[model samples]
Target: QAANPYERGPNPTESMLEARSGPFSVSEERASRFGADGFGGGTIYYPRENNTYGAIAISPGYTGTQSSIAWLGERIASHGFVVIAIDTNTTLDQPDSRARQLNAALDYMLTDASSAVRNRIDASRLAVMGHSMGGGGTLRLASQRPDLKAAIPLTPWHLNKSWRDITVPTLIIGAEYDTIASVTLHSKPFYNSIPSPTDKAYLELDGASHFAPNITNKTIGMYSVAWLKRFVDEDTRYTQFLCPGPRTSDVEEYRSTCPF
Candidate 1:
């Protein structure tokens, strides 16, 4: 075991970070759409290790299914987490609904998950992530839950541009060419509004569009894992990956508060 009780995997490398999976084998549980209070039931992915892992809940854009964020859920879980990739109760549910649903899913993980899955989670360490409107929800939830460990909003869209009240460590991944939630309108504003004292970062993906979150992308995977590990796991090994955020042709531009 490592010195950090929270650290769960081997020291990370660029190749390992870019890989589709991580150090832990992953397992999945399918959640039915029925009887889930606020969010449509989705999939829960957890590492097979006996030790506890941090937990995350993810939501998708309008009209997206659990499947929209499933791949990333698995990727994150493989790195040592219990991630619930969720769906809106209705396809038309807005950011506010998605925000509530994100919380609902977190509650479900703690109280409704099978002992097999629930036993592997550290309830105190929690994070939230989402894409597009779901990204907006991610921010909303973080503001409401000051205890949240971290937040990642990918190509997020929201009508309310300000996020000054958010205290959680946040990593906002913005696609440079996103017409729907362009950097000019969405990502930048959200990142800018977060208080300067907050640990935060903004990475703009080069040549990508609003739909970029719908697919597998290395930059998104690599940094997301780093942010989660750095904050949720309180793992120092992942800090370097986020600070310099180093070289990535994939990243057109990046901004961060260093020594985080």
Candidate 2:
């Protein structure tokens, strides 16, 4: 059996930047109804360890692919969790195709097993993230998997009742200058809809543009790490990320009711 490519552990000083990219096999025998969609595949990034607490499924923005978000994916995976950044299509403009592709990928992860990865995956502890159109897909995917442990939609779209029904620990991120103003769209409503016991957060990065800074940028990566540490890693050191009050004044733009 091949070594599991996705596995990581926590060590603050350790750099959280590494990703693996390849074509994932989606045989029908793996998931009967929800097999691979054959759109595009991506890589999984994580610590060098063999065991991890959970895993993350990432989608890309418009015209974006695994390579686009690979930088951020590697950083997140370094926090001791498996991170899978998927490719939805050849080009990134098709939201509908990308959304379904993400769903299929999730289904594949839950069932598919091969030499590359055995049963090392922790399906129960899963989260979905996306940028731009991919962000919208995150909301749609979360709606389908109401049991999702966490979600991070970067400038997602605001649509129907899906945003009103989310019930997991969610973090919606965006830039005040982003043309999409995604915070006002699905991020705000989704944050408000979460009724879970876990903490939730909404942060607006000032002077940021829509997908300009890229996910790998140190500043963005730091914020992403902080968010994942709280929800994905379940770490208490950064519990403040989930809880907001007078102390949160440091955030660029913030609003939330998450209790510490």
Candidate 3:
């Protein structure tokens, strides 16, 4: 078997995951609107580690800016990955458009970003994430980009929910009290649509709303860090935190095809 050279951090723990930051020192670069030609520009966050790491592109929900998902950029980066939290061309851009922008954002990182940023990322090891409509876009992009390693859609909302074509490892974080994109209509059905063979999980945050992801919740940060590490780096060391997962009021419900 091949060794996991991409692994960049120490073993995981509740203490480490729940904290606001992670093991590696982190840095950021600005991707201005004029510079990101393919999408509305946002910010790039990276680990200060010398070696290349996996890259993740993030999109925001309807009527949201990059600032809505800003916390994810630095939090996930500190755990050893390149995180691009992006803004769509328009705040109202639908899932398909958001998916395109997500791709464009990843492309920008790989080709147009500063060498200081690009050289730190392994293009082959990439992922996608988003919240609400952006989360809906996350699922869409995963299907379109089969090579991606993983995905996470936060309270995603989309009209066409059959996602049997999404082959990438995915973690869907749904808010229990989301009136706008109720789990009944969006998250649960979306999770069910992905084939059982695919690596996937659905996490229901108790008392959380559609905008919960907009906030920097500890549960969201912890699972997201673990999910990215587990799949992007192929570092199974983080698996312990995922399988049989967390059991607390913070997590209203959990479902998974564990031991991946």
* Tens-digit lDDT string for candidate 3 (125-166): 999999999999999999999899999999999998899999
RMSD (CA, Å), each prediction: 1.4, 6.9, 1.0
- Minimum summed lDDT over a 10-residue window in model 1 is located at 30-39
Please count the clashing residue pairs in each candidate, in the order shown.
0, 5, 0
User: Which is the better candidate, 2 or 3, if ranked by TM-score?
Assistant: 3
Arranged by TM-score with the best first, the candidates are: 3, 1, 2
- Cα lDDT for residue 3, model 1? 92
TM-score of 2: 0.75
Query: Model 3 residue 108 lDDT?
Result: 94
Q: What lDDT, from 0 to 1, does candidate 1 have?
A: 0.91
In candidate 2, stretches whose alpha carbon ends up further than 4 angstroms from where it belongs are: 1-38, 90-97, 189-199, 212-215, 245-250
Looking at model 3, residue 178 earns an lDDT score of 93
User: Which residue ranges in model 3 land beyond 4 Å of their true spot?
Assistant: none
> What is the alpha-carbon lDDT of model 3 when measured against the actual structure?
0.92
